[PDB]
Amino acid sequence: MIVFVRFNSSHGFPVEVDSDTSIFQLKEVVAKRQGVPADQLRVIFAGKELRNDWTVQNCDLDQQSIVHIVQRPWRK
Numbered sequence: 001m002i003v004f005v006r007f008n009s010s011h012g013f014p015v016e017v018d019s020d021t022s023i024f025q026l027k028e029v030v031a032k033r034q035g036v037p038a039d040q041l042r043v044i045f046a047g048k049e050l051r052n053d054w055t056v057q058n059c060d061l062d063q064q065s066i067v068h069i070v071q072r073p074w075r076k
Contacts, residue, residue, distance in 0.1 A: 002065075003017060003019035003029075004065075004067065005030045019043070020045030020048075020057070021056040023039060023050045026043040026050055026067065027050070030043050031072065044068045046060065
């Protein structure tokens with residue numbers, strides 16, 4: 001599973017994992033590699049906000065999906 005992790009900004013990074021998967025899962029992959037917490041903020045995919053079975057793979061995901069994450073920003 002490889003999904004692009006996008007932050008609420010014009011900036012997206014390719015992630016090799018399902019990014020919309022359950023709120024715990026999605027937030028984990030993003031926020032973990034996002035240089036941020038895990039599930040602090042909110043994560044989204046294909047316009048559908050973090051839904052365990054409605055937004056993730058059980059939602060409508062392909063091998064190469066793109067998820068829009070709104071994770072907590074990094075503080076240098």
